[PDB]
Amino acid sequence: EVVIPKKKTWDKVAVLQALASTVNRDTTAVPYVFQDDPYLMPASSLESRSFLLAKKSGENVAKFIINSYPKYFQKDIAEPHIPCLMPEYFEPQIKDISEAALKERIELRKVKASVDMF
Amino acid sequence: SEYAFRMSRLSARLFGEVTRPTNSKSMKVVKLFSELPLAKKKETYDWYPNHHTYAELMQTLRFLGLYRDEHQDFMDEQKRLKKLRG
Amino acid sequence: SLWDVEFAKQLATVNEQPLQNGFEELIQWTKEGKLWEFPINNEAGFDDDGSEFHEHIFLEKHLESFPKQGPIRHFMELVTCGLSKNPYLSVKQKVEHIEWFRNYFNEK
Amino acid sequence: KNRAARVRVSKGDKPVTYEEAHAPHYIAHRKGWLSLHTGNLDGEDHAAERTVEDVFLRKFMWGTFPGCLADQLVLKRRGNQLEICAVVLRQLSPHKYYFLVGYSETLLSYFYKCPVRLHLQTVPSKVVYKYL
Amino acid sequence: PVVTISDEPDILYKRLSVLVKGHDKAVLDSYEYFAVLAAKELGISIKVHEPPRKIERFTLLQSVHIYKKHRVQYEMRTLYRCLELEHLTGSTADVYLEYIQRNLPEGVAMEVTKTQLEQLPE
Amino acid sequence: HYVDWRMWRDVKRRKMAYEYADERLRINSLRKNTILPKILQDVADEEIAALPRDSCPVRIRNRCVMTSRPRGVKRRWRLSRIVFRHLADHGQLSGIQRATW
Amino acid sequence: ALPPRTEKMAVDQDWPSVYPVAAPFKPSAVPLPVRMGYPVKKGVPMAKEGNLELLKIPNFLHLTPVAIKKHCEALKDFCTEWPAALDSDEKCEKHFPIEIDSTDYVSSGPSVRNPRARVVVLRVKLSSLNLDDHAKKKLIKLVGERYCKTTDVLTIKTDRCPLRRQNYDYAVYLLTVLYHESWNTEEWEKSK
RNA sequence: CAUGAGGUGGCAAGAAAUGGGCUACAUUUUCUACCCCAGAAACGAUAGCCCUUAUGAAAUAAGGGUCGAAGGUGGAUUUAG
C-alpha cells in the first residue's frame, strides 16, 4: 500500500511572507527604502521626507520622459509580456469624429478634448 | 530483406518520418522543413543592435542634460573652434 | 464602472505603505510581474493556443488528401514530415505554409 | 612590450587603485571580474547581447553620474535582478544622488525590461592602493 | 501561512539531480555546504559528486596589424558540482528548489535540475 | 547613427533577408527535391532568379557587434579580436582567464 | 558622515534581521573589518570601507547557519512525506514502472527561453511491463536502435514538439501505440 | 556637385623569379587483411580532362573515373632540436 499524499498548492507569495516572518523588523536598522550609506543617511524626519520626495520626483521624471519618447522602449525582451513595464500612450490615436474616439479620450481623461469633439 | 524493409516502413509510419522509400536528395527537403532556415535564426536577425534607440536616446537625453557625453562635448568645442577660424 | 475602479485606486493608495524590506521589494515585484514566476519551468506563458500534440505532427486534416499515388502527394508527405519535425514553428505557420503550397500548386 | 591594461610608472606621484593597478595577467589570480553574468559559461546563447548591454550600462553610468564614480562599476546579473553597484564619491548633494538613483533605476528598468537595483556606496576620496 | 491542500496525489520525483556549474570552486562548495545543511535539516538524503571541469581555450592575435607569431591565449574555467538527490516529494521539491534557485549566486552559477518523476503506465 | 555605411548595409541585409526568408526556403526545397518535372522546376528557377539579390543569405557577413570589422570576429560574443582583448583585459567580462597551462 | 552601525551594533543580534536578501557587501552594514587583496611589500591587505573586490565577491553573508535553521523552521510547513516505497530500486520499480525524463535549464537574464529544455525521454522496463512474448519480439524488431542487451530498458526520445507537456504526451502515446502495434498480429509474420 | 551615397557588371593572368609548407624520388618501400608473428609486388600529382555529389541565386570543396608527368635523396649556403 502506497500512502501517496495530495500536493498542497500555493501562490508565488506565501514563501516570501514566511520569509518576512523569519525576518521580523531590525531594531537597529533603518527602513529599507533609504540606502545603507552613512553619508546617504537621513538624520531627521524632514531630511527623510526630502529624500523620499526626491526619489518620487526622479520616478515621475523618467515616467514623463519615457511617455514623451515611447519609441525608444518598444523593444520588449522580457518574457512574459509586462504591460506595466510597457510605456503608456496618452495621445488620442483615433482622429476621425467617432464614438470610439470619444471612449478613447474619456479613457485618456482629456476633458477639453472630449468636450470639443462631443 | 523484404521483411526488414517493411519493418523499416512500419517504424517510419509509426514514428512519423517518411514512409515510402525516398533518397537523400529529398531527405534534404525533409530536413530543410525540419529546421528553421539560417535567415530565421534569432541570432542572425538580432546579431546587430539596432543602434537607433541607443544613439538617438542618448542624443535626446544629453540634450535634456541628464546625460554628459565627453566625446560629444569634445567635438562640440573642437567644431566651435573650427567655425571660429576655418 | 468609474466609481468602483476609482474606489479600487483609492483603497490601493490608502493601503499603500513603505517598502521597508527587500523581501517586500520582491513581493511587490512578483505582484506587478517584474520578477519571474517562480519556480521556473522554462515555459512561462508560451501556450500555443492549446495545440496539444496532434496539431503539430499529425497534418492529415490540413493535408486534405489529393490522389495519394501522385508525386504531389508524395511531396506533401515530405513537407508534412518536415513540419512534424519542426519544433520552432507553430501549427498556424505550419498550416499557412501548407496552404501556400496548395495555392501555388493550384496556380500551376 | 605589453600595454594592455597596465598603468605605467611616471616617477612616483600617480594615485591608482587596485583595479587599474593590477595587470590583465592577474585577471582572476588577483583581481576578479567586474561583471558577473552567466552568459560566458559553456552552455548559454545570449552572451553577445549580455556584453553589449554591459558596455551600454557602463558608459551610461559614467555619463549620467558625472565626475562622481570613483572607479569602475560592479555589474552583477542574477536571474532577472540586474544589480548596479557603485562606489560614488561624497561631493554632490544627497537629494541629487537620490534623484539620479531613481532616474537610473527606472530608466534601466524600462530599457532592459528587468528589475534593476542601484546599490550605492559613498566614499570621501578616491582610494589609493599605491603611487606610480 | 496558507497551505491549500487541494486535490490530487503526488507527482513523485525520485532523483532530482542538481548540476551547479560555474567559474569559482569556492562559490560551488559554499553553495554545496549551504544546500547540504538545508537538506540535512529538511530530512532529505542529499549526495555530492564532482564531475571534472572543462576548460574552453582559444587563441587571438596580440597586435593590431602584423605579428601572428605573438598571440594571446584565453580560457574559460567551467567547473561542475553534481548534487544528486533522491527520495523527495513533489511539494517538497517545489519548496526546496524554490529556495535553492532564489538564493542561487550571481553569474558564477547555472543549475540544471534533472527531475525523474515516476508515474504509472497507461 | 551607425558605425559605418557597411554595417548599415549589413543590417539592411539582415532585416530584408529575414522578411524575404520564407519563400526562398519553400522554393529552395523545390530546388533540392527530386520529385517534380524539370520545366516545373525551371519556372521556379526564373522566379528565384527574380527574387532580389540582397535577401539571399550568402551576402550575410558576421561583422562585429561593436565596431565594423569583417574578418577576425568570434561568434560567441560577436566581438572582434582586439575589442574582445580590450574588454577581457580590463576584466569587464567574466570567466575569461589568460590561458597558462 | 556619521559614526557607522558597524560599531553601533553589539553582540547577540539577529543577522537574518540584518540581511534578509542577497545584497552586495555594504561594509558599513557589515560588522567585520574584511581585508581584501594582494598587499604591497611592506603593507597589509587593503581595508574594508571601499573595496570594489569585496563588492565583486558573491557575498554569502545573508545565509548563515542560524538563518538556514530559522528560515526552514518557517519552510517546514510546505512539505508532505513519502510512503513506504522503500529505498530498494526494484521495489520502487515494481510499485511505479515507467521513468520519464523532463528537465529545465535555468538561465539568468531577460528571457527564460531555453528551447532544448523541452527535451523529454521515457525509459521503461519489459520485466515490469510483464505482458510481451512474441509482442516483445515484435517490439524489439520495431525499436531496434534502442534497447541495449545488458539492461532491459527501453528509451524513447522526443524533441519534436515545442511544449514539455505535449512532449510527455508524445512519450506516453508512443508507449501505448508501440504496445498496441506489437500486440497487433500481422499477416506476414510467419514468412520471417 | 564630391574626394561623399546608391545600383549593375568586371578586377585575383603568367616570357619569369623568390620565401614557407605538403607530397615524393621507394626495400625500414608499396597494396590488402590485421591494426604490427601473413600474402603479394619489386616507384610518384592533394597536378590536367570527364562524370557525380555538397553548399550556394549563380562552382570552391568532396568522391569516383581518367591519366601514368618531371623525378634517381639535391652543390655553395642554411634551419631546428
Swiss-Prot record, chain C:
Q: Which domain of life is it from?
A: Eukaryota
Task: Give the UniProt subcellular location, in the record's own words.
Answer: Mitochondrion
Under the subunit heading, UniProt states: Component of the mitochondrial small ribosomal subunit (mt-SSU). Mature mammalian 55S mitochondrial ribosomes consist of a small (28S) and a large (39S) subunit. The 28S small subunit contains a 12S ribosomal RNA (12S mt-rRNA) and 30 different proteins. The 39S large subunit contains a 16S rRNA (16S mt-rRNA), a copy of mitochondrial valine transfer RNA (mt-tRNA(Val)), which plays an integral structural role, and 52 different proteins.
- Report the family membership: Belongs to the mitochondrion-specific ribosomal protein mS31 family.
Q: What is this protein called?
A: Small ribosomal subunit protein mS31
- The organism named in the record is Homo sapiens
Query: Gene symbol?
Result: MRPS31
Coverage of the whole protein, first to last residue? 276 to 383 of 395
From Swiss-Prot, chain E:
Please indicate which superkingdom the organism of origin belongs to: Eukaryota
Q: Which GO terms describe its cellular component?
A: mitochondrial inner membrane; mitochondrial matrix; mitochondrial small ribosomal subunit; mitochondrion
- For this UniProt record, give its keywords in alphabetical order, as a comma-separated list: Mitochondrion, Ribonucleoprotein, Ribosomal protein
Q: Where does it reside?
A: Mitochondrion
Q: Which residues form a coiled coil?
A: none
Q: Which GO terms describe its biological process?
A: mitochondrial translation
- Does the keyword Nucleus belong to this entry? no
Q: Fill in the subunit field for this protein.
A: Component of the mitochondrial small ribosomal subunit (mt-SSU). Mature mammalian 55S mitochondrial ribosomes consist of a small (28S) and a large (39S) subunit. The 28S small subunit contains a 12S ribosomal RNA (12S mt-rRNA) and 30 different proteins. The 39S large subunit contains a 16S rRNA (16S mt-rRNA), a copy of mitochondrial valine transfer RNA (mt-tRNA(Val)), which plays an integral structural role, and 52 different proteins.
In which family does this protein belong, per the annotation?
Belongs to the universal ribosomal protein uS10 family.
What's the protein here called? Small ribosomal subunit protein uS10m
- As recorded in Swiss-Prot or TrEMBL, the protein's gene is named MRPS10
Shown chain mapped onto the complete sequence: 61 to 182 of 201
Swiss-Prot record, chain F:
Keyword presence, Ribonucleoprotein: yes
Where does the record place it?
Mitochondrion
One GO CC annotation, please?
Answer: nuclear membrane
Q: Which of UniProt's keywords are assigned here?
A: Disease variant, Mitochondrion, Primary mitochondrial disease, Ribonucleoprotein, Ribosomal protein
Molecular function (GO) terms for this protein are:
RNA binding; structural constituent of ribosome
Is Ribosomal protein set as a keyword in this record? yes
- Highest taxon of the lineage: Eukaryota
**Biological process annotations from GO:** mitochondrial translation; translation
**Subunit structure, briefly?**
Component of the mitochondrial small ribosomal subunit (mt-SSU). Mature mammalian 55S mitochondrial ribosomes consist of a small (28S) and a large (39S) subunit. The 28S small subunit contains a 12S ribosomal RNA (12S mt-rRNA) and 30 different proteins. The 39S large subunit contains a 16S rRNA (16S mt-rRNA), a copy of mitochondrial valine transfer RNA (mt-tRNA(Val)), which plays an integral structural role, and 52 different proteins. Interacts with LIAT1.
Q: Name the linked condition.
A: Combined oxidative phosphorylation deficiency 38: An autosomal recessive disorder due to mitochondrial dysfunction and characterized by perinatal hypertrophic cardiomyopathy, growth retardation, muscle hypotonia, elevated lactate, dysmorphy and intellectual disability.
Task: Give the record's family classification.
Answer: Belongs to the universal ribosomal protein uS14 family.
Name the record gives this protein: Small ribosomal subunit protein uS14m
Q: Native species of this protein?
A: Homo sapiens
From Swiss-Prot, chain G:
Molecular function in Gene Ontology: RNA binding; structural constituent of ribosome
Name of the encoding gene: MRPS35
Which organism encodes this protein? Homo sapiens (Human)
Q: Which family does it belong to?
A: Belongs to the mitochondrion-specific ribosomal protein mS35 family.
Predominantly, its location class is mitochondrion
Instruction: List the keywords (alphabetical).
Output: Coiled coil, Mitochondrion, Ribonucleoprotein, Ribosomal protein, Transit peptide
List, in alphabetical order, the GO biological process terms annotated in this UniProt record: mitochondrial translation
Q: Which residues of the full protein are shown?
A: 52 to 243 of 323
Highest taxon in the source lineage: Eukaryota
Q: How does it assemble?
A: Component of the mitochondrial small ribosomal subunit (mt-SSU). Mature mammalian 55S mitochondrial ribosomes consist of a small (28S) and a large (39S) subunit. The 28S small subunit contains a 12S ribosomal RNA (12S mt-rRNA) and 30 different proteins. The 39S large subunit contains a 16S rRNA (16S mt-rRNA), a copy of mitochondrial valine transfer RNA (mt-tRNA(Val)), which plays an integral structural role, and 52 different proteins.
Record localization = Mitochondrion
Kindly provide the name given to this protein in its UniProt entry: Small ribosomal subunit protein mS35
Gene Ontology, cellular component aspect: cytosol; mitochondrial inner membrane; mitochondrial small ribosomal subunit; mitochondrion
Per the UniProt entry, the disulfide pairs are none
The residue ranges crossing the membrane are none
